[PDB]
Amino acid sequence: TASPADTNVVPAKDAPTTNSPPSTTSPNQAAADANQQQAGIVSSQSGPNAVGDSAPSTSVNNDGDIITRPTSDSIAAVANATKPAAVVSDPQSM
Amino acid sequence: VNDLTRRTMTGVMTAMRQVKTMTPFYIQHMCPTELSVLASVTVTPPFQV
Incomplete structure (x- = not known):
């Protein structure tokens, strides 16, 4: 009941x-x-209402960009692209 | 629409008009009571304009 x-x-x-x-x-x-x-709605019954509408999607960033992976990974990617060696070996080092 | 069809259509329409139905009475006098009651039990309260 x-x-x-x-x-x-x-x-x-x-x-x-x-x-x-x-x-x-x-x-x-x-x-x-x-x-x-x-x-469950079929296009033949929604008629003109189906043509112009748009809805939020995961592929769209909060900033309004097309993203293909979670934003943290994008941050990680750019961070990893710049990591100079901490200790280098050169003859003149004192 | 010859005459025979014209009368046939007229007979059908008036038949639809004449048959008794409680639906209008329910809507004007009973349905609002049920709606008011149900509006207070759902987790999501009604959202109206």
Whole structure:
């Protein structure tokens, strides 16, 4: 009778962007389409509402850039690109 | 639409109009009571404009 599943419905974790497919071309439109198809709506019934919409995607950075890996790794990548040797061997060292 | 079809359509439409239904009564007099009650038990309260 008093089914909790019908009373305690709340958005799941990572809800706003979970369905976003991994792509770089048009992530927001692609994510929007994925949400629409995931929700069970078919394009033939949504009509004109499906053409211009866009939704948040994981491929888009908070700054508004196309990202292909977690931002920490991007930070790690640039950091690792610059690591001069701590101790070097040269004849004139005192 | 010849005459026979015209009457047939008219008969069908008036048939739809004449049949009794409780749905309008339920909506005007009963449904709001249920909605008000249900609005206080869900975790997510109603969001309206």
